[PDB]
């Protein structure tokens, strides 16, 4: 087991960074897809103009 420096806190830091980095980036698809679906539904609705 080669000695490992005190960069354990650096690991803590970058993990605590990546957590929100990925949370904020992932929590968007759930919305962006439903907005797409709603707009597309509105489009077919309007397709019956006659």
């Amino acid at each position: 087991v080669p000695p490992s420096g005190s960069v354990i806190d650096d690991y803590v830091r970058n993990a605590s960074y990546l957590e929100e980095r990925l949370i904020q980036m992932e929590d968007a698809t759930d919305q962006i897809e439903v907005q797409k679906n709603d707009l597309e539904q509105y489009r077919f609705i309007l397709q019956s103009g006659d």
């Binding site: 962006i32 489009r43 397709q47």
Partner: protein, 49 residues
Amino acid sequence: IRKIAESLDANLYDVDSSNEGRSQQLAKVNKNLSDLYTVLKTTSTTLES
């Protein structure tokens, strides 16, 4: 009709009575969906990367 529709499984919208007005509505609502089409691809490209 409006306040009975929601009680059951329903969705509400609004549409212009005129015809070319509906055409313009279609054009304006169609303009702003390519961005929506692309954004998911972008975020995925970031995610898997």
